[PDB]
Structure formats: structure tokens, C-alpha cells
Symmetry: D6
Subunit: 163 residues, 12 copies
């Protein structure tokens, strides 16, 4: 019952990592080339794009994948050079993944709107801008949040048993 | 008679997976760059493209390839760490592939039209938009539906024998 | 005399497969970007391109390469799991390659014209469109038809001996 | 206490090297295509871009990654051909990394502004130009400066013990 | 004296093959995008480009590299399945390489002009068109002709000795 | 003292080769797309670009890397088939690298100007053109000249000892 | 009381005629140059302009001015060549002016909208078009209808007295 | 009865002449600027405009006004220098006006279509072109034909009496 | 003292009328061609121009010139057909000119701003538009208001004496 | 018989002069704005227009009208200040009009072609240009040549009688 | 001596008035269409044109012509209705013309520069703008100032004699 | 002999004045709109046009017509208010016309070139610009110089007789 969950964690991790490496890289290719605003101003496309999407979805997910696999790198490299390390590494993984999930919800939310209203310099008054591919990016948002939730839950399976 | 079908399933799976990795990625390269609508409105190209093609054909097929190979990943990883697992994994594969096939038919259908009629904001009244490469995408649709059907049938070969 | 022909078949197959993987992919890169029609109509470039070239040359050749190597995949995978299989696989290869060659001649012919005359909707009356790179695509057509003919002939060498 | 720090240095190094190889290459793809100035002058976009960003962020970081791993290449190649080499290589690594960090702060600083004011020939009087993606490049700047600081500190851990 | 020449042939062959795989592919990237003619006619750029450069330089060199290495593939595959084969393969290599060299001189010549004069349909009367990068393509032409000559000469070294 | 210099030569060679393979390829990507001249003439951009930069910086450096490693290829291939070869190969390497360095200085010099003055046909009288990225290309020029000098010096270390 | 009304009719007539000759000609100058529709279709601007404004306001008013002064031309030319003519000419003037007023109301109405919805060939489905200067043309419409009403009333003053 | 008709002829003549001098000149101002064809060909707008409208409506009407008033100029100038002249001048006026009316019907007809189909050189195959203001030009056509008919009839009133 | 004021009224009237006929017509020529708004919307230039300037300055002044000279036309035409008429005509002129002056102040005010903020359909949110020639139109506004005031005052000179 | 011809000369002269003043001025309005050539060259439109039409049709006809009425101006001004003058003036008129007619035929001919082939600097090789309104200008050419012929003939009527 | 000066004043006045009515109106036709600034900003052309030329040269000269002829209109209209009026009118003319001349020098100066430097909103920092036809406008400025000076002097001739 | 020359002077004067008022005004209409230079610089068209044609041909001829008729205005106005005036006026006319003719030759010369070479700021180095209509302007130049010469000669006829 409790033993197999490790199989589930490993498989969702590698799954999680190749959806994000083979699918996500090309939904987000033309983000800024196909982002258009309704103005004649130079430099308002750049301002309003950077205000709407300060850090892209896929950069945050790459960093979140790499950062929650660093504790394992420590646990491997300690073994090669040679259980108190084990529990520490597990609690640190749990803390990192919860912090990253809640930071995700607070950065992005649950949706990607199709319109944005922008009032940064050099734009005059407020302007309207149009996102390219909002429904696919919404589906990807919700899929990553669900997988993140599943691994949060399964990591919390192991915590209670030994702790 | 019944024994060889496994050879056929494995070969159609790897076949299925490399047509989709070497051919499909570049029919769908210029989908949004070569999608044109008949208007002067900013932001109606984005709205009407995202309404016509909410999730691209090839993202659904990547996910369908990866998702129907996850049960095997569980069956391998259980064997390394060490028959009731076997039958469960087979029935889950069958259920997943049937659900994905019927979801495909209900998302996309059997054709890709050359014209689309769109009435989303910011577009004014209804507008006409023009798909790039509708015949090749139709041939690919029908080919994937046929291969999906073949593996559905051959998976259902094995179910009856043991079950 | 008869024995060496297998060497010739294998070498023309791998030859055939790397000309098509290293040369063909970039003659056909800019096909639709550099296809131009003589009109002011939106959406007539897409219609007339898709009417002229319903399935690209190189997609048909990829599929023809992959499809005429699937019988060997069956013959290998049967041997790993463990002569009546042999002759069946050979006659199926022959039938597949002849069907694909004649289907090629009936799809494409022997030439690629430099002009095309098109009368699809949304185009008004008939229009004239201009193919990019017709001579190189003609040379590639004729080269693939000749190599296909050579392997058809050499496969038919083996049929008569055992059959 | 002191022994494990080597694990931390190695892991931050490989970490540091793959964030920079998988993330950084595509924030900086469209830097000059999406850099716009407010003029009708030919050649003022080139002048003002090259004045604002004389050496890109990511070229400096590639060179800094490669240059602070060359002492290890010397220490490996000496061992294959066959402790005084060791301490020398460590002090040289420390000196190189401190020099590169302070040179970074003096080249770039801590921010990337969204506007630039430029008065190079051929531009007339002073002109205003607009950076694409200033917030993401700022986050990357600060992240690289923090990781550089961490490895500076941990290298200085080892110096005091033997020295 | 005579023995070492084989070392020279092998090294010039691999040399010849990686200059052509790492350098040549990107001189010829923008050939048709940066080819411009002096007209307002649709479809005269395509006609005049295809008349000037019917088969690109680098496609001919790829085919010439692959075609003059096929005899060795026959000589290897015969050895695995198991001197009269040897001499035949050598004379065939010599004949192939001389035929390809002289065909090169008769297709392309020794120069790439910077201007071209074109009178194909749909162009009106004769028109003037402008080649992009003629000096680099000339240097590459002459370099490939010189290396081809060197291997022609060294192959003819071996012929006389045994023959 | 004299023995270790070989370590330094090997490491600067591989260093030299990966700065040039990972950094240089993308400074020189948009050279001709972002090269602009001040005219309305068709075909003066092509003429003046090819007059300013007859052979790109990075093609010369690729060829210089490959050409000064061919003597080692001869020395390896002789050893496999089996000291007079050794000294010959060293003097040939020295001669090749000095010839390539001085040819570099005579082709390019020490700078890349930001303006160019051009009077080739089809341009009318003399025209002014604007280089993209002159400071980064200058830094790369000077870096390659310095590394070339270092290996020239260290090769000349070995010459005197045996000679 | 009744006698002076003729003074009022003559003065409103000449008034009516010079507002229409000095003011009206240049409100209606740029009508078709500044009429814009929201499409990319050739020839939909012409179709939709001609459907919206089949006969311009000012052509109808010129014809109405000229046509209701022709009876006086008959009455003058009869007198030069030399009371039954008089009453006939008056009743004909009355009939003409009432017919022209009611025809005006039935052609144009009381307003000029700022938007028009158009579904003529070559336009696709229905389209939206934008009138230039709708408020000034509305003020002119209402002013001409009021003056027309005043002269209708004053002509009907004279009818009853003699009739 | 018969005497007054001369009053009617004179008044319709001056009427006819000022509708044509004050109204007609500006319906036909932008005829060729606002005539558009559906092509990218240079010089097909000129060819197809000149094929559709070989002689403008208003040039024919100016000439018809001037030509049917020349007999009166002869009759006046004869009287100043000083009945057989009279009847001759009347029959010549009648013949001229009938010839001009029937020539009008045979040149232009009764309508102005909104579309024209054109196959003149330099146009490719047949093309579609769009007339500006077809309804107003139709109303003017029919009005001039009706007035021409009225004066034809009234001239034929006088012929029978004396003749 | 009181007698000469009539000379002043007549001369300011003809003065007033030729400044407005020779100067004003061409300040207001390019009003709508040189009116620009900051948007990509079709039809927002028309909407926002017509909202900013519903009736042009010069149409109101033409009508005000013509309307305050109609009482004199009545007083002349009464005299030709033949003091109670006199005083009535004077009080009506006074009332008309005061009503027109105060209506002017309430329509236009005392300034013409260089910017306008507009939120009419089809414009999105509020937009900014730019008036051409605001200082010259301001000088003309103030000049016409001053001359109007002077004639108001001098007309009120005559009222008190007889009344 | 001979006496009336003077009436015919005077009337054809004034006729000739008002067709040319009321019709001709606006066929030739847009001659150079609507003259298009098939090139991208600056300044080839100007060169080829000025080569095709060195002196416009209507300037030659204005000068021919004014120059053949100057002898009458001499004959009038001599009479005011106060038969040998008479005959001289008539023979000079005849000589002037014949010289102008034959000069017309030698300048222009009898047609206006729709295409022109031009090889002036700055044009490259020969180019094709397209005349606007060639049929109307042909009709005007032939009409002026016929009227010129008629007055030539009638002037030659008077010569023989007195001479 | 003193008597003839009146002839000179009248002739310079009518001279002055027809140079300004026949020449000046078309130097100043394209002033704002051919005024260009070096920016991409909407609305900076309007701002900077109106800042450079607040009131056109020719409007000031029209007003100066009309205003210095109003005293004569008073002197005529007084004579019709019927020497103290005379001297008053002369001193008022003198005062008006001197005030207008010095106001001219203080508005415009003696030159029209070819460049203007502008820093009004919406322009960013300071911008450079280019005047069309500065030398002709300078010649006209100096000519009007000289003629104004001549009439100032000759008016001052008459003042001293009677005064 | 000597008496009639006055007839010739008067007629050439009025002739001279109406060729220049009816023909010249529209050769010089599009001078600056159809003047094109070969650059991308803003403001180089204005600079180079104003350098090439500082004062237009037709402004100089208007001023020369008006200035050589002012002495007659003096001679008329002296006669109305009432032989020493006569001779003075004649010598002044002669001096004015000779000065204007030689000033013409020194301003303009005898030709109008089709190309101009310009090196004014803001133009970069020297540029080439293209005159519109050089042959017609040359014919007009030579015609005005010939007529000017004729009146110079005939004025000099009268000088000698009385003087």
C-alpha cells in the first residue's frame, strides 16, 4: 500500500519532466511576435508585453523541475564519496515543492485572459492588448497545477510514516 | 494465432510514435503564421485562431502517446524493485486508449474544413478565416484514427482470452 | 550471381534513406512561404497551394520508407521472442513497394510545372500561381522514381528463385 | 562540516551550468529584432543597440563558466600523464571567480532599464530606445549574481583551512 | 612512398566531408530570401532564381560525397557476410569521381557572377538580378574543385601500381 | 618546466575550439539581415555587404581550427596502420599556424568599423552602410588573435629543444 | 398681409440657392475618400458606399433647385416673345415642390447614421462601414427640410387667394 | 398650341446645358483613381479601365451639346453679315440630334454595371474590376436619354408643319 | 458723432466678409486629412473628428454673415416694389447678431486645444487625437469674436437714439 | 458659294478653341500620376515619361491656337491706329497653319500606343511602361487633325480667288 | 517733386497687392504636406509645424493689405453720403503701416531657416524638422519688407508737408 | 517701317503674357511632388530640391512681366492727373528688360538637366536626384529667352530714332 507510492512518484516526475520538455517549448515560441496592442506608439508593445508576462510560464516550470531535483543530487553525491541525510533531504524536498506550488498560484492564478489592459509608459492612457493562444496556455496551467498537486500529496504520504 | 498479436501491437506502437515524431512536427509549424482572416481589426486573428483550434492536433497526439505508455512504466519499475499487477495494467491501458479515441472523435471529428466562421470579440459580427494545409491535416487525422482503431482492436484481442 | 543482390538491396535502402533525410528536408522548407499567386484576395494563396500540392513530396517518401521497413521489424521481433514467416514477409514487401511506386506515379507524375492554374474558392475565376524551385523538385522526383525502380527490380530477383 | 562543502560546490556548478544552457539561450534570442528606437534614421537602431548592450549577458556568462573550469582541466590532464599543483589550482580558481564577479558588477550592475537614451552617430541629437524583456533579464541578472556569490563564499571556505 | 598515400586519401576524405557538413550548410541558407530582381512582376523572382541556380552547389556536393563512398559500403558488407572485388571497387570509385568532377566543371564552372541576366516567363523582356554572397561561394567552388583534384590524383596513384 | 607546456597546448586547443563552436555561431547569425545601407537601389545591400565582408570571420576560424589539426590526424592514422614523422608533423603545424595568423592580420586587421563606405555597382557614387554588432565582433577578433598568439608561442617552445 | 409674402418667397429662394452653392459643395468633397469599411476585400468599399448613398445629398438639391425654377423660365420667355399662363405656372410650381419634398423624406429621412451595415457582393457576409461627417450632414439635411417646408407653406398662401 | 413649343425647346436646351455643366463635372472626377481591379499586375488597371470606358460619359455629352448648337451659330452669323437657310438649318439640327441619340444608345446602353470582366494585355487570363459610383452614373444616363428624347420629339413637332 | 457710426458699421461688415472669404477658406482646407488619432482601429478617426468638431468654424461664420444680411435684403426689395419697416429691420438685426454671438461662445469658447480625448464607438476605451493648426484657428476665433463684439456695440449705438 | 466660307472658318475656329478649352484640359490632368513603369528603379518613371511624351498634346494645341490668331491681332491693331496688309496676313496665316499641321503629324502621328519601350538612363536595359487613357487621346488626336484639315482646306479656298 | 509721389504710392500699392495675390498663394500651398520631422511619433509633425509657423506668412500679408486700405474706404464712404477727415485718415494710415512693419520684423525676422529644433509635447526630448522651400520664402520675406519700407518712406513724405 | 514696330511690341507683350498665364502654370504644378532622390534620409528631398531650383522658373517670369509693365502704369497715371516723362519711361523700360534678360541667363542658363548631384545637409556625401519634365521646361526656357530677345531688339529700335 505504502511501498508502491515511490513508483508513482518517480513515474510522475519523469512524466512531468518530458511533457515540459517536448510539448511546452513550442506553445511558447511565438509569444511576443504574436502579441499585438492597439496603438501606433513605438515601444508600447514591449512595455505592455513585459507588464503582462513578467516571467514566462515555461521558465518557471523549468526552474521548478530543476530545483526540486537538487536534493537527490546531494543524496547521490554523498553516497559516492562514502540515514540522517535521508530524512533531511525528504523534508527539504517537501518544503521546496509546497513553496513552489503556492508561489505559482500567487504569480499566475488559474487562467490566462485573452485581453489585457495596460497603462505603462510610453503608452498613452490605458490600452488594450491581445494574447496569442490563451486557451492552450490555460490547459497547460491547469495540467501542471494538477500534477504538482499529485506529487505534493504523494510526498506527504511518506512524511507521516517515518516522522 | 493469438500469440503473435503482441508482435503486432509493439510494432504498431513504435510505428505510431515515429510517424508522429518525424512527420507531424512540421506540418503544424506555420499554423498560426499562415492563418489569415478577412478583416482590419487588431486581435481578431488571435481570437479566431484560438476559437478554431483550441488545442492543436499534435499536442493531443503527443499526450495520447505518452499517457498510454505510463502503465508499462509502472510494470517495469515494479519488476526492478522486486501477475495481479499484469491484468490490472492491461485493463487500464484498454480503458485509457478507448477514452482517448472517443475523446478524439468528439474534439475534432473526421475533417478539417478550409473555411471557418467566427464571431468572437474583438471581431465585428461574423468573419471568415482561412486554414492553411487542410487536406494534409485531414489525411493525418484519418491516419491516426485508423491506427488508433487497430490498436484498440488488438488490445481487445488479449482481454477476452485471460478475462 | 544471385547471392550478392542482397548486398545491393541493403545498400540502396540505406542510401535511399539518407539522401531523403539529409537532402530532401531543406529543398522543401520554404515551399509555402515562397509560393505566390497573382491576386489581391485573402485566402487564395492557401486554397491554391493546397490544391496544387495536397500532400508534399517528402511526406510521401518518409511514409514510403517507413512502411516498406515494417515487415523486417516483424521478422526481427519474431526471432527475439523465439521459414514460413520469411517468404510471407518477402511477398508482402514486394506488394507494398509496387503499390507505393504506382501510387506515386498516379499522384505526382514525372514533372513539377512552374505554373499552376487554379479555380478554387475564394479565388475569382481562374488564377495563375508560381512554384518555387520546380527544377530541383523535378530532379528529386526522377531520382526517387529511378531508385524505387531499382529496388523493385532487385526484390523481383529473389521472388522467382524460391517461388 | 567542512568536508561536505565540496558536494555543494560541485552541485551548484552543474546547476549553474544547465540553467545557463537550457533557459538563458532563448530569453536572449530576439534581443535585436525586438529592440526599437524612435526615429526614421537608417542605422540608428544598430548604433544604439550596440551602445546599450556592447557584450550580451549570455556571452559573458558562457565565458565565465568555461574560464573557471579550465584549472580543473589542467589538474585532470596532469594526473593522466603521470599536491603542489592542487593548492595553486585552487587559488587560481578563487582569483578568477572573484575577478569575474566584480567585473560583472562593473559591466552591468544590478538592473536592466526599460528605456535607454542614446546620442551616437548617425543619430540626431539624443534619442530614446526601448528594451525588450527588461524584467526577465533583471531576474536572470540577480539570480546569476547570487549563485556567483554563493560559489565565491564556498571557495573561500576551503582557502582558509589549508592555507 | 606509395604506401602512405592511403593515409592521405582517408584524411582528405574525412576532411572534405566535415568542411561540407559544418561550413557549407549556412553560406547557402538565405540564398533565395536574399536573391532580388529589379521588377514589379509577381513570380519573376522564382523563375529567375531557378534559372540561375537549377541545383544548388551544396546538394551536388552532398550527393558527390555520398555516391563516391558507396563502393566502400559494398566492400564492407561483402566481408561481413563471408581480391577480385577489390580492384573492381577501386576502378569504379575512380570512374565515379572523375565523372563527378568533370560534370561539376560543366555545370558550374569556376566563378559565381554577381549579376545575372534573365528572360524567362513571366518576366518582361530581359531583367537583371543580384546574387547574395558571390565571393564566398566562389572561394568555396574553387576549394572543392582543388580538393576533388587532389583525390583524383591520389586515386590515380594506386591504379597504375596494381593495374 | 618544458614538459608541462604540452598540457597547456592541448587545453588551449580544446578551449579555443569550444568558444568558437558554442559562442561564435550566433554573434554572426543576423549579419546580413541586420546590415543596412542608405539607398533606394535594389541590389546595393548585397554588393556592399559582400564587398565589406568577403569571407565571414567565423568561416575563417572554422577552417583554421580544422586545418591545424590535420597533421595530428596523419600522425594517428600512421600509428594505427603500423620519430621522423613526428618532427615533420610539428614543423608543419608551426608553419601552418604562423601562416594562418599573419593571413588573419592581413585579411581583417584589429578592428571592425561601425561604418563602411562603398562604391560598387549597382550603387550610385559612394554610399554609407552600417554594421550590426561591431563591438562584440571586435572583442572576438582580439580574443582569437591573442589565443592564436599564445599557441604560436608555445609551439615555438618545443621547436627549439629538439631542433 | 398677403402682398408681402412674395418678398419672403423670393428672398428665401435666393437664400436657399447660395447656401447650397457656397457651403454644401465642400462638406461633400471627401465623401468617398474618407468612407472606410472593415475588410481586406477589393471592391467592397465601392459596393458598400454606393449602396449606402445611391445619389448624393447635394446632387438631389441642385436638381431640386433647378427644377422648381423652370416654370419661371417659361413665364419669362413667353413674355419676351409677346393670365391663364400665370395660374398654371403657379400650380405646377406647387405640385413640383411638394413632390420633391416628399420624395426627399422618402429617399433620405431625417438622419445620417454614423454606421452602416452592408451585405452586397463582393463583400463576405455582412460588414460595417463608417460615414465621414455624419453630424454636419444631419444639420444640413434638417436645414434644407425646414427651408423647403417654409416655401411649401408660403406657396400655399398664394394658392387659396386666387383659386 | 404649335407656337409655344419653341419656348419649351429653348428652356430644355439651357436646362440640359447647366445640369451638365454644374452637376456632371464632379460625379466623373475620381473615375480612374477609384477604379480598382483584383490583381498584382502593373498596367492592368490602365488597360482594363480604358477597355471598360473608352470615352467618358461627360465628354460625349459636352460634344453633343456643342455640336447641336453649331447650326444656330451659322444662322446668327449669316444674319449679321447681311428663309432657305432656315429650313436647312432645322433639318440639319434634327438629323444631328437623332444621329447622336442613337449613337449614344449603341455606345453605352441603359445601364452601368458594377462589375466588369476584362482580358486585355497585360492582364493574365480574365480579371474582375469594380466601377465606382454605378448607380449615380445610371441615373444620369437615363436622365440624359429622357431629355434627349424630349427634344427629339419637339424638334419633330416643327418639321411636319412647314415641311 | 452719432452720424458717422454708420460708415463704421458698413466698413467693418465688408471687412468682416472678405477676411472670411479670402483667408478663412484655406486654414480649414486640410482639417480632416491632417487630423490623426493614436490607434489602429478603422473608423475611429471619423468618429473622433466628428465628435471634436461637429460643425466647422467657417460654416458657422458663413451662415452668420449671410443671416445677418437678410434683413437688408428685405428692406431693399420692399423699396423697389414701392419707416415702420426700418425700425423693425434694425431690431431684428440686433437680435440676430446677439443671438449668433452668444451661440458662438457656447458652441466653441475661446480656444482650440491641441489635444482631444475621445471615447466614442468604435474607439476602445478613451483615445488621444491631435488637432492640426490650433494656434492659427485660435487667432481666427478671437479675431472674429472681437469684430462681432464691435458690430454688436455699434448696432446698439443706433438703438438707443430712435428707440 | 465663295462668300459664306468665311462664316464656316470663323465658326470652326471658335468651335475648335472651346473644345480645346473645356474638354482637353482634364483628359490630360493625371497623365504623369497614372503613368506606371515595371521597375523598382528610382527616377525611371520620370525618364521614361519624358522620353515618351516630350511635349504634351494639349500644350502644342494651345500654342497652335494662339499662333494662328496673331496675324488677326496685327490686322486689328493696324486698323485702330489708322489692302496690302490683308493679303499678306492671309498668306502668313495659311503658311503658319500648314506648317503647324505637318509638324503635328511628324511629332505625334495618328495613334497613341498603350505600351512604350524605354531604354534611357537610369533604367536598366529596356523597360515597359503603360499609358493611361490611350483610346481617348487617340480620338482627340484624330479629331484635331480632322478639324485642322478642314480649316486648311477652307483657307485654301480664299487664296485662289484673289491670288 | 512732392506732387508725383502720390502716383508712386498708388502704383506700389496695386503692385504690392497683385504679387501677393498671383504669386504668393502657391509658394505656400504644400507647406504642411511637405514639412517632415525625424520621428515615429504620431502628432509630432502637427505640434512642431504649428510651433515653427504659428501664423503663415501669407495670412499676415493679406491682413496687412486689407487693414491699411480700410481708412480709404472710410474716406470714400463719407464723400458719397455728403478736410479734417483727410489728415486724420492719413495719420492713421501711417500709424497702421509702421505698426504692421515692426510687428512683422518681430514676428518673423529676416530669414527662414532650413532646420528647426522642436521640444513640444507629444515629441520626445528635442527633435529636428525640415522646412520645404526656405530660399524662396526668404526671397519673398525680404521683398515684402523692402516694399513695405518704400511705402513707409513715401507716406512719411506727405506727413511733413501739411503737418 | 519704323512706325509699325509699336504694333509688334504690343502684340508680343500680350502674347508673351498669356502663354505664361495659360500654359506655364501647369507644367510647374507637380515639380516638388514628382522630384525624387535616391536615399532613405528624411529631409534630403527638401534640401536637394531647394538647392537645385532656388526660385522657380515661373515666379521669375511673372515678376519679369509685372516689373516691365510698371513704367507704363506711371505714364498712364500721370496723364489722368493732368514728353520729358516719355523718354525717361522708355529708357527705364529698356534698362529693366536688359537687366532681367541677362539676370535670367545667369540664373538658369539654356538647359534643364535630367540629373542633379547634391551634397547639402542632411544628405550623406553626394546624392543623385531626378527632375520631372526636363524637356518641356527646356523648350519653355528657350521660348521665353527668344521672345525676350525679340522685345529687347524692338525696344532698341525706338531708342536710336529719338535719342
Amino acid at each position: 500500500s505504502t511501498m508502491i507510492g515511490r513508483i508513482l512518484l518517480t513515474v510522475v516526475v519523469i512524466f512531468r519532466i518530458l511533457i515540459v520538455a517536448i510539448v511546452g517549448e513550442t506553445v511558447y515560441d511565438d509569444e511576443q511576435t504574436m502579441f499585438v496592442c492597439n496603438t501606433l506608439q513605438p515601444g508600447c508593445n514591449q512595455a505592455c508585453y513585459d507588464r503582462a508576462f513578467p516571467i514566462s510560464h515555461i521558465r518557471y516550470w523549468v526552474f521548478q523541475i530543476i530545483m526540486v531535483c537538487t536534493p537527490s543530487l546531494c543524496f547521490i553525491t554523498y553516497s559516492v564519496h562514502q540515514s540522517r541525510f535521508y530524512i533531511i533531504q525528504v523534508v527539504f524536498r517537501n518544503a521546496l515543492e509546497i513553496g513552489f506550488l503556492v508561489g505559482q498560484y500567487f504569480l499566475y492564478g488559474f487562467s490566462v485572459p485573452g485581453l489585457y489592459e495596460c497603462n505603462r509608459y510610453p503608452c498613452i492612457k490605458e490600452v488594450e492588448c491581445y494574447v496569442s493562444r490563451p486557451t492552450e496556455k490555460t490547459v497547460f496551467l491547469v495540467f501542471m497545477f494538477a500534477v504538482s498537486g499529485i506529487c505534493v500529496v504523494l510526498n506527504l504520504a511518506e512524511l507521516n510514516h517515518l516522522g
